Design a protein around this nucleic acid. Structure first.
Lengths: 50, 43, 99, 119, 89
RNA sequence: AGCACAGUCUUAACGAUGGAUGUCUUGGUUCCUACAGCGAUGAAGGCCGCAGCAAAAUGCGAUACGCAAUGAAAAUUGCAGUGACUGAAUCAUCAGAAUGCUGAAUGUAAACUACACCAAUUCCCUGGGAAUAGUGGUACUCCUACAGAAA
RNA sequence: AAUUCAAAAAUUUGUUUUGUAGCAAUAGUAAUUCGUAAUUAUCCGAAGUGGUAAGGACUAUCCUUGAAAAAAGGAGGGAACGGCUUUGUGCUUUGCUACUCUUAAUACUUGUAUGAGCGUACCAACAACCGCAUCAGGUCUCCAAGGUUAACAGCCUCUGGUUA
RNA sequence: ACAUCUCCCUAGUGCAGAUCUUGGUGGAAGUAGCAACUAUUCAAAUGAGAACUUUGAAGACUGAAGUGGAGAAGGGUUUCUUGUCAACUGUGAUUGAACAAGAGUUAGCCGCUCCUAAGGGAUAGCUGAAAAGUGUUUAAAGGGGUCCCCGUCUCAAAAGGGAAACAGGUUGAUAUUCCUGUGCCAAUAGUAUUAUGAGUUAGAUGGUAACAUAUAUAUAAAUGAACUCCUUUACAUAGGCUUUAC
RNA sequence: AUACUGACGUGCAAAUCGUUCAUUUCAAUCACGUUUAGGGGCGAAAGACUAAUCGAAAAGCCUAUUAGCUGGUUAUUUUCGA
RNA sequence: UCUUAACCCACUCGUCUUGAAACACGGACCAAGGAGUCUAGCAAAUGUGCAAGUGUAUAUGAUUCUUUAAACAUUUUACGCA
RNA sequence: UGUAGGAGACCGAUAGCAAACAAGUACCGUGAGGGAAAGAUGAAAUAGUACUCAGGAAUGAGCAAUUAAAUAGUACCUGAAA
RNA sequence: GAUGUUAGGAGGGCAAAUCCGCCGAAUUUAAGCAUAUAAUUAAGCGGAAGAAAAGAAAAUAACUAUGAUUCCUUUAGUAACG
């Protein structure tokens, strides 16, 4: 659920989340768009994770 | 339709997943296959 | 043969009464001490139509005999009665139309 | 790669810490897999089987600890009582089944059936 | 006329009257009266019959997973005392 | 570099087409022998999952084609990887540990991941320190006990 | 509306200037140049037809009078009622005057103190539906341009689509 | 792998036919036939190969009761890009709704989600061997106030009722959902501070009336319990008239 | 769905096509939800209709139902023969 | 042996039928499958053993226990039929 | 009946369990339900078709090549008839 | 008798071959059919076990009397019903 993802992402990475949108795919996997806050800037954090 | 109930959507995905052909490396060690147009899922 | 047309009419399927717009049953104010020993005067507030029968129904207000405030009943209307008429019920009520 | 018996001695905090560490590694392997990388894809199986092993040891350790706490007492939680069949659980104790009325007991004691031989 | 009993009328089919059924997985839960054709769902009982031999064999014990019965097999032959282990090496 | 009529029919040799025949047979079959109930300690059944590369069948259940432990016991391999010099690889055994959502299904529901109410709950450390909206409980009927309400 | 000047009241009327009323031009669209993103210029004065749709006020028709609740609101009623200090058993008598409301912000505790879960592709028939199938069949709703015209008819035309 | 005629036991034992069964196959035959839906042509590209792939130029048709937009049921990845031609695409085919490989569906505001209707399923009883048939018919039954008062539970609308959202832009494929702007709606606990305005030395004013009145970053705030009484929710059809919008 | 007893009738369709025609504010039409089930339902009544199935639906079983009736009823030679 | 000839002869088989070459029915072709059985009880026939008897039933017994689920055995008024 | 053993004067892939194969599967039906087809290379594919030539491609051919055998070439035993 | 998320416990469902209660047909046979027959069968519904049910004389006999229950062999195609 969205709340759990937001907490989880903050725990797992330096990310803080402005808004989290989710969708259930056909294949059985959930896809979460996590919109980053201006507290950090995504590109570096993305580069570090992959 | 546009809308579905979650169980039905998940099932439609399951059938779609089921279709996927046999993996090509496996043959180097099919008979049953959904095709959408003439062979309805029905469920 | 098979079940005749008359028999089918009874059997509680589609032939049930056409309920939907009916305004509720017409039955007089139930018997109590206040009526039995005297009279109670009520107000006809409205006359309203009914999809079932030719007679109109009469919306009658009483004030309750053991609790505060007004309670509404549905009486079947006598001819020549009217909205804003006082309607009286009981052993001592006077002989007058719609009492 | 690590083996059960070496794990079994260890303190519970350390065991849990090790499990958390393996989970993090496992996540890293998956992140690699999701990217275009092929190189370390074989190693994830090892990590996962190791994760499973660590979990088994900890759960078993807890089970023993819980049983040790709930010695005697006549009132274990249902889970720790016997997992014999429903038909067995309902049934009489042998001690009860065996037991007999006093006169019958007197009768058996006085006249037991006996062993004998003939010409 | 043009809605005719054969092909015109067959065209007019829209809306299944059965859905999936929790207890059967066989698409036979009759929506309007909330009831399964192949198990009676809100009724506790399975909905067997002795007339359909074929129906019994296509849904009897041993067709499915047997998630507990399979495990219990062999136990009778071994007859191990409960909660016991084999002694270490 | 010449000669044959064509068609239709018949014959023989060599072919196509087809899958009979014969031969097999990790299957059926019947009889005989033997044991023989599972479930609120949550079954049968159904879903839903689960592999590095994986669809079904098989297997298994969020530790997920297997974990532990015991007995065998050096390889396992399609590639990739992982292994000995015997709790490591492979089997078999299988008792420990683990057993998703359901389903009699039992908090109210149901074409719903909808909805209550009461406990906040769990872990670590030897009386403290951390986590997590998570986790339990709460059907109908009954029986023994007990309770405070009525005669 | 703001503003201006003229005539007012111990803060009005008359006259002028502004603003697409704010949102609003930075956004659109048609242009125009230069790099190979950047600028410039435009964006408004009168009116008619009545095709659609909504509303208003209504009139008539009925041996037919045309759902219900969730939810919300209003009123009648007059229960309850300073704060602080204090003897005595919420109450009583003494001493004192910033009090009762009410938005919004803030800080701290209280489980982690803001927005749950599910649907959202595409066809909807001309090939995606059903009819044993790419079947001249059947299948629910809204949108409605110009000319001719009683006309949402029929004929031809624009937008859009197609030339299978 | 096979015989047994030496003798003899044993049987699902010998086919042309049953409008037999099953599987295969001919003549009929390169035939019937591939006829609805106004109709196509020229040049270029791609390719082994183009009447029906793509592009340009013509000529045409559909003709806003549309082969145009949206949507419902049903279908269910048919979408998109990239490949691509074994079979299929009743001609051809480099095409394609086929095959292969990846990819795609983002909401406090749009819906579901909540409410009740026609109705459904249960509870109390009672029947019935049971299965079931009934739904308050002998109920000690669910909530609200603080010992009193209400009082069957539950499902049943994706076109009835219904808290709140619009514009522009953007992707190969989504958008009232992403991006930018602007808002709106709903929550928003206790305790303590602050600031905002009211009333007071326990409840404001105006207006003859119909009635009006808080413009504070914010029209926040105008005492009110039990118990009551309303109203909105909330409704047919026909006909004309009129006003605004497009 | 009237007429053409027109097209088609190895269909474009197990009821289609063309032209003609009846119907349009009401005993009107449609959608969806909902109700009633097999000697039963439903019927502005044709024994109509109840999923191409109706003077008794569809499915399985009793059931390899039963049939003085039809069809079929398998190598040779030899002997006697209606 | 096959192959054509030639003289002479020669009607579609199966079939039900008083009477089929039939203007009677079934047969396009081919391959494989495809139909008087089994049990019960009764009868005669004939074979075989014993003979006023006969059958050893159920069952027991055995150094009988791959075969053997058969064979073997049955201390001087069991039962059937006679 | 479920499961485990053991058997046979039983069946031999159109048989025998419907089912020797990924079978209660595919497929059909609104549904109750209905419900298949399809076994065999060779000793060894750890022998499964290298190489050249003609082909756009399929394929073909070879003086080339696995095999005892490829007229055993993955439609893989034998290979009748129409 | 109510009431209790009071404390401990139990029942529900699946599985049926054999097993136990109910409830209960007809096709059929009779060359028709009505009583009989099919059959205390099939279907329907409830419940158990490794077996169950039955069982320790309100029995049979009419003898020189036997002596819980079940099963086999039998009486017996008989007494009897129709």
């Amino acid at each position: 659920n969205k709340k759990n993802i937001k907490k989880s992402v903050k725990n797992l990475f330096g990310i803080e989340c402005d808004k989290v949108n989710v969708l259930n795919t056909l294949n059985g996997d959930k896809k979460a768009y996590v919109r980053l806050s201006g507290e950090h800037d995504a590109l570096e954090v993305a580069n570090k994770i992959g | 339709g546009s809308i579905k109930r979650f169980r039905l959507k998940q099932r439609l995905g399951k059938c779609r997943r089921q279709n996927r052909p046999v993996p090509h490396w496996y043959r180097l060690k099919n008979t049953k296959r959904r095709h959408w147009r003439r062979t309805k899922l029905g469920l | 043969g098979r079940v005749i047309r008359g028999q089918r009419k009874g059997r509680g399927s589609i032939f049930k009464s056409h309920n939907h717009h009916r305004k509720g049953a017409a039955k007089l104010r139930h018997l109590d001490y206040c009526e039995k020993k005297g009279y109670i005067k009520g107000l006809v507030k409205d006359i309203i139509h009914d999809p079932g029968r030719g007679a109109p129904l009469a919306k009658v207000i009483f004030k309750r005999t053991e609790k505060y405030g007004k309670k509404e009943e549905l009486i079947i209307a006598s001819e020549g009665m009217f909205t804003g008429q006082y309607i009286s019920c009981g052993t001592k009520a006077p002989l007058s139309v719609g009492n | 790669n690590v083996k059960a018996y070496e794990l079994r001695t260890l303190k519970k905090k350390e065991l849990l810490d090790k499990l958390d560490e393996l989970k993090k590694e496992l996540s890293g392997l998956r992140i690699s897999k999701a990217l275009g990388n092929s190189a370390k894809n074989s190693k994830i199986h090892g990590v996962r089987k190791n994760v499973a092993r660590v979990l088994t040891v900890y759960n078993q350790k807890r089970k023993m600890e819980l049983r040790q706490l709930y010695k005697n007492k006549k009132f274990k939680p249902y889970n720790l009582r016997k997992k014999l069949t429903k038909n067995k659980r309902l049934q009489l104790s042998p001690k009860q089944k065996a037991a007999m009325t006093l006169r019958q007991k007197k009768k058996v004691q006085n006249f037991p059936q006996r062993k004998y031989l003939v010409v | 006329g043009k809605a005719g009993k054969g092909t015109g009328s067959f065209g007019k089919r829209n809306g299944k009257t059965h859905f999936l059924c929790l207890r059967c997985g066989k698409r036979s839960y009759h929506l309007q009266k909330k009831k399964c054709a192949s198990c009676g769902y809100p009724s506790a009982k399975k909905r067997r019959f002795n007339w359909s031999v074929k129906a019994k064999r296509r849904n009897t014990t041993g067709t499915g997973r047997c998630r507990y019965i399979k495990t219990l097999r062999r136990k009778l032959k071994n007859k191990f005392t409960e909660g016991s282990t084999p002694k270490p090496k």
